[PDB]
């Protein structure tokens, strides 16, 4: 269960950053080191918890992202327009070239 936080680059200046918890299931664990910046594709589900309802006093639910893929964008923030989960991954034709 990795905890995404809004990137300081995309946070509006002077505002507090929002954050959502992200569940990494099998084969996705240990793929995002702490402090790195990543792009998470996944289902945006919500589950009911009594603690949140008690705290806020309204029938409010807690949301969470079940990650389906992760691409790290830390250290390649100028690499927009590229395709794939790994910009540096090469196909067989690329290796032949």
């Amino acid at each position: 269960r990795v905890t995404l936080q809004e990137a300081p680059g995309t946070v509006p200046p002077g505002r507090l950053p929002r954050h959502r918890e992200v569940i990494l299931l099998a084969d996705l664990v240990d793929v995002s080191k702490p402090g790195e910046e990543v792009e998470v594709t996944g289902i945006y589900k919500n589950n009911y918890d009594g603690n949140l309802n008690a705290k806020n006093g309204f029938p409010v639910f807690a949301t969470i992202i079940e990650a389906n893929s992760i691409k790290r964008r830390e250290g390649n923030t100028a690499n927009e327009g590229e395709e794939g989960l790994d910009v540096f991954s090469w196909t067989e034709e690329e290796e032949r070239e």
Binding site: L52, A54, N56, V60
Partner: protein
Amino acid sequence: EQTERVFQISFFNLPTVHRIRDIRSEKIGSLLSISGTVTRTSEVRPELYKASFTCDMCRAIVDNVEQSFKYTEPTFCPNPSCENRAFWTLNVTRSRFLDWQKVRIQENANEIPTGSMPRTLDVILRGDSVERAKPGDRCKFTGVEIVVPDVTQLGLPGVKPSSNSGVTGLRSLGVRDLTYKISFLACHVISIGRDQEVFLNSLSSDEINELKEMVKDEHIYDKLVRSIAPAVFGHEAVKKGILLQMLGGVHKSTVEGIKLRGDINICVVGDPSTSKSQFLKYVVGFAPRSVYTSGKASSAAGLTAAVVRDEDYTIEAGALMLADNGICCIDEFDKMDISDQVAIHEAMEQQTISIAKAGIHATLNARTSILAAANPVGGRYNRKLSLRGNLNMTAPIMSRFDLFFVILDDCNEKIDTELASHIVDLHMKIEPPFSAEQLRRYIKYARTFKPILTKEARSYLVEKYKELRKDDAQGFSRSSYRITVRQLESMIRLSEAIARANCVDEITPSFIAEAYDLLRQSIIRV
């Protein structure tokens, strides 16, 4: 795929506006217009609105179960063969959810009686009115005022009651008491404190006429220069520089990913009696997304950024960041120390602030144009020395400033007469050829232009840069000191800004000659 539409009636423009102090429990269930300064906003969580349960056996669907402050669920199954009094499985897909945000507003500063602490309130925002009240902004909420019970006492499937006058005796309560808390429920909130075609289509025809008169004008450039900061007498060169600053250049990005700066930085160095702070105040009060700050470093966060431990680390936004995509009017640029100047060397050229302090590491964005105002060393400007001598700034930071404007209060008996007549004249009442609201739309229209360099413009630009470097050559080894390739990029930026002033999409060699004059006048100061 029918999608039921839930409506939200919004009432606004109430005859009277209440306040946090004027809250009374006798107004519960009534429309108010509470106004206060927001200090904290929660996340946009989805709250259950119209639940739809499916019982665990016989799969019967209980639907449109209205929800109270609790997690109320149906008690009985419509099918007369299902045994279910506490067992259901909510259908999340079928249920209807609503955006829910809780803002923590407080009393306005001017409404707080002396000594008394401000009174706070918790205002619930639902639907489209979510995220419309940012912290710090004074908003004028309006909606029903309700009272929120303690749902812990009411009993919840996942928690237990936790330990001022609480009533009791309810069937669902038993022996525990119930306490109530007043909380506003806002239905409408307002704060009280781009291609060319896209911009044009968003402008009314009457404004389109005024803009058409400007763009077709012959002396539009000089009129704009004279219309910048009308309350300041003289200083046409500084007015022109400030005008070119707002237009800016083109923030180009090359194929290799390297970003080329498009913002123009000005430094108005002048004697202590001059009108530097007036220019800075006009710019901060006119240009959108602009801030005013001094070199005294008021806040703990510097001009750029800082990390503060929470009793984890978080980033405090500095002055150079709050003015992103705008103008950062820095005052007293000399007062801020040399150990502070090294922080903005990157923020003024690469336009990013890179922080790696402790567990936090980010490359923050500062796409700002700096309008500094530095007093010369020794208080009064000394014309016997070059601009380098009169300023404590070093070469790396002095080369990042596009324009240097030197303004002096020469002891002229006549000039003081016009100055005094002007200041006293203003305090008594300046006729600008373009009013502020009228000029703002012209600047917005001109910013949509992205001028390009013609073929002869490139040759003229290269020749002018060669002349600049030839005239700046110093030393036996011919080592340029004041003029680097940053000056060539500065000529390009000023040419683009000038072409935007004339609202022309092509850069002519006349514009490059004018930009060369603007740079030359800032370095021939000997």
